[PDB]
Symmetry: D2
């Protein structure tokens, strides 16, 4: 309850799923948390539930929303120590020929440029506090995924951007790291599975993609985020895998012709 | 002179630098090559110089230019076997706070979406020929670079997109690979160095960033591209490093406090 | 003080350096710790200093020493939750032609087979407790190091072995992870630097190999180990980098000929 | 037929499987090849079949055999340009608790130290010719494999050793690279499958572990080796994946508990 006491954290997309798990983990570590989300429902309830968390409506694709998010965080709490760029989306499975450049641009706006924009506006305050940035990327940025060309590209960009910014901000004492989750059971996972012919079979395949035989939990991503913020003082530019071992070994991906 | 005989290759940004080296390597392997570039000067001369290469003016950020590039390649040569997505740019060094979302969008349009667009329009023809895609990414997508947040992000996206598309096109027999060059001596390298306070010192630092103690040549990237196209039939989704060992070992990147 | 309460941890090479930092971190988390070392001096003092830590003399290259280490841990504390395989050595810099197969075998015995042997003897007890294995590898297993062919090979083996065992033990609920430190200021670092022509210059080069501009501390590796043991329940087979960003960007490793 | 004309290549384990494919590829490129193998049957026949290849009986675990291999290569052909360290073995699947330290030592002797020993004895001659080293590692050194702790560890060591030696030999102009094959259809693959309850099912699983839906061929590893030797002059310390995409995407490796 004291690992991150006295610190102020902003979590984007904090109203449900991984983001809400990260919010809870930081509150449990003693921090004050600003929950950013484009939707009011989950985040407002979380603000009522958790002493030490407050909700600010903010769409990270809207630069003026993000400017207000940062200025209100500083006005209300007087410092900013950690930004967790969690807001993002995975579209339904799409074959490459079914994608469009305009859909790709829109997904880049959320998954990549929203992370870029908040980070940029927050960095002057993170420099003052020797704070840190945590980006939520994805394992599939590293290893690929089927029927997800735009999504995979956006997460490869987030992971690479994390390393570039880590280099640039290292002289100023600001660490920049990312977490790459694998299959985490969240409302997005449940929504995507419900679109499939056999949702239950899709969910079973998702569980068995991990050597551990289950999906991950938001709380497990949250613990990884609290570690990076509060105890990983010699880590910058890392990609922390929270995947249950999905990237390990041979599997079903499809004699020598 | 026969490793890729009878095949038809499109090289974007083929008028100078790495692209021209790739053009030359494919012509030397027996292929017919379409040189795409937004600038006429280098590519037109290359078409006069090389029997088997022709020049088509085409800005890869302009979807209708790219549509015409593909339709003219098919009209003139009757097949398409390999697309090399080489067109790209590295801006001058820029501190993160000096970047803009709009500059970032513009660089994504070239380095990422131009590659996406040509690949999409070419894939129906590559399926017919069991052809392949070669994207020119960058080592710094993998390891980061200072003062280059947008550039690094675009190359992380290209490398990840390569793996996603490799998965999607594997059932159709179309391989998708990338080359990640390190420091290659090209007109872009020379132009960026000339902007620096001490261009000669910048160039010396660039040479010594490699264990091999020199920069790479366009011809060396070209040989790697010809290998991927013509002889790497069990390679898909790989990132072929052509970096002189820059990613190896400890170096100068900046007692325990 | 409660994150790992009630748990029992064995740390090899725990008498000084990173190992002692790991011992301290686990004691501070509420665990009981068995300090294994081949030398009595540091570990015996640490046992007097820390309530909750005890010292067992044990050379991890001697199978019967390791058998007794495990049986005494169980006899004295009734369970085993975590094994930290930290014992290892880095020889002085050696050019490849100055190495020997017999020196290579000896270093494999310590850095690789000692880790293998303790893990094997501990796994029946870790299965009962759903415990975990933490191996201390090295960044240079991943990126290489000059004048260290045998050492680098042993750490590449440890990191790979970690992933293999993670796969094998996943059905039994036992996680297997590794930490790859970069330059950590330890008595070994100080001893190796003292052998060099200009020890102070060697130490300065070591600090500047990190974007953060300093070396790491044993306490920072220890915090990473406590995270992996106590809060990383969806992590198995990962390589957690604790390197200060040394693997990022271009540096001094040595125009196109 | 001229890419590697006038050059002299040693291939260990060249009598069958991948090694024989590499021998054939180098002969087809114009090189003279010394086939090293511990067994006479395949290699002697290959020497009769291929003008430009000769067979030398040599067990790479026996230092005096390897000394004679190098001295006879120089005596008979007057130079040495490339060493391909292909000899190696994969034991039958073994659960971790079924392995032994002594079995692990024996596999290290072949897969790791045999590569080390030939490389060491060859390097004085490779320096004179600005030649290169190609080690045959494995994809599973990078991603792990089930029931193969010793094997995986040996290949992680080979890949890491490749990078270390690349650093050390870069000032002398000698490149050191590795190839990491995935599932390649070889007599070893066929022998291991025949040990399983349902060999045909094991082979089908092996094919489907690749997005390409087949296993690789020795000839495909051979083409990769010829590329590294003859045309990859700015590549050193790389790991060239010849895996059919097995490392890409999610698969079958085994809702959030
Ligand atoms: N669930 C997984 O398996 C998984 C795996 C790897 C990575 N990720 C990443 O984790 C993050 C969270 O995923 P999730 O599964 O929890 O998703 P989710 O859809 O359950 O939750 C996302 C939250 O972000 C909010 N959000 C979306 N767009 C926003 C915007 N423009 N501005 C502000 N808030 C916005 C949503 O309203 C929602 O509350 C995403 O970046 C995702 O790419 C998820
Ligand atoms: N030079 C290096 O060290 C280096 C290193 C790693 C990666 N790369 C990548 O290699 C590629 C080539 O780089 P280079 O150094 O040869 O650059 P360059 O600037 O010398 O050549 C690039 C060529 O692409 C053309 N081009 C640019 N924008 C275009 C567009 N919109 N449409 C069509 N053609 C366009 C240019 O006119 C030029 O002829 C780029 O993708 C770059 O990111 C270069
Ligand atoms: N210091 C670094 O920069 C660094 C970097 C990366 C990895 N590592 C790894 O971290 C680990 C600890 O390194 P360190 O710098 O603290 O070294 P150190 O030499 O300061 O401490 C090592 C400890 O292990 C003990 N030990 C050695 N051989 C042993 C054996 N056979 N049985 C039992 N105990 C034995 C020593 O007596 C000593 O107390 C090693 O595995 C090393 O390879 C260190
Ligand atoms: N087959 C695959 O799927 C695969 C995948 C990845 C890596 N590899 C690696 O490729 C290499 C070749 O494998 P393969 O499948 O062709 O095996 P193989 O068993 O079919 O052929 C190996 C050859 O090496 C020889 N050899 C073995 N021990 C030797 C020794 N001590 N001295 C000299 N020669 C010796 C054998 O007699 C044989 O001719 C090995 O290093 C293996 O680990 C193979
Ligand atoms: O959101 C999904 C996902 C999964 C793994 C990742 F690493 C990641 O970043 C996101 C997801 C969920 C459900 C799905 C269902 C079918 C197909 C794809 C699906 N993807
Ligand atoms: O274009 C450059 C570059 C270098 C390495 C890469 F891997 C890459 O993709 C591109 C470059 C050139 C010259 C420079 C000069 C100063 C700073 C950065 C520079 N970058
Ligand atoms: O022990 C050293 C070391 C450094 C980095 C690592 F990643 C690692 O595993 C071990 C070390 C110390 C001091 C030195 C001094 C000179 C040369 C090498 C040296 N190596
Ligand atoms: O030799 C095998 C192998 C496979 C993939 C690799 F990447 C590698 O280095 C070696 C192999 C063959 C057949 C098998 C059959 C069952 C289990 C494992 C098997 N392994
Ligand atoms: O909807 C799937 C899961 O999403 C998670 O974020 C919630 O914490 C779980 O209660 C829920 O089962
Ligand atoms: O401008 C730098 C270099 O660019 C390369 O693309 C050209 O082939 C070289 O002739 C030139 O020296
Ligand atoms: O010897 C170098 C360093 O080693 C570390 O393990 C100790 O904790 C430090 O007190 C010491 O300065
Ligand atoms: O035994 C499996 C395969 O091994 C390869 O090395 C041979 O070239 C093939 O003819 C054979 O089918
Ligand atoms: Na509240
Ligand atoms: Na022409
Ligand atoms: Na004590
Ligand atoms: Na012959």
């Amino acid at each position: 309850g004291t690992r991150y006491a006295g610190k102020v954290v902003v979590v984007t997309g904090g109203g449900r799923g991984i983001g809400a798990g990260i919010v809870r983990a930081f509150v449990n570590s003693g921090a004050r948390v600003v929950i950013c989300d484009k939707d009011e429902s989950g985040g407002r309830a979380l603000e009522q539930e958790l002493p030490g968390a407050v909700f600010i409506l903010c769409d990270v694709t809207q630069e003026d929303d993000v400017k207000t998010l940062v200025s209100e965080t500083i006005r209300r709490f007087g410092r900013l120590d950690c930004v967790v760029n969690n807001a993002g989306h995975h579209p339904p499975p799409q074959r490459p020929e079914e994608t469009s450049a305009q859909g790709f641009r829109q997904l880049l706006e959320l998954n990549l440029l929203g992370t870029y924009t908040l980070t940029k506006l927050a960095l002057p305050y993170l420099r003052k506090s020797q704070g840190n940035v945590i980006n939520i990327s994805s394992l599939v940025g590293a290893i690929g995924q089927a029927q997800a060309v735009p999504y995979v590209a956006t997460k490869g960009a987030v992971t690479a951007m994390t390393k570039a910014l880590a280099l640039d901000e290292s002289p100023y004492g600001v660490r920049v790291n990312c977490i790459s989750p694998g299959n985490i059971w969240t409302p997005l996972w449940e929504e995507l599975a419900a679109l499939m012919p056999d949702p239950r079979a899709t969910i079973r395949e998702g569980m068995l993609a991990q050597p551990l035989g289950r999906m991950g939990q938001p709380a497990e991503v949250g613990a990884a985020a609290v570690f990076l913020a509060s105890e990983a003082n010699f880590c910058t530019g890392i990609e922390l895998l929270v995947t249950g071992g999905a990237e390990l070994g041979y599997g079903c991906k499809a004699p020598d012709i």
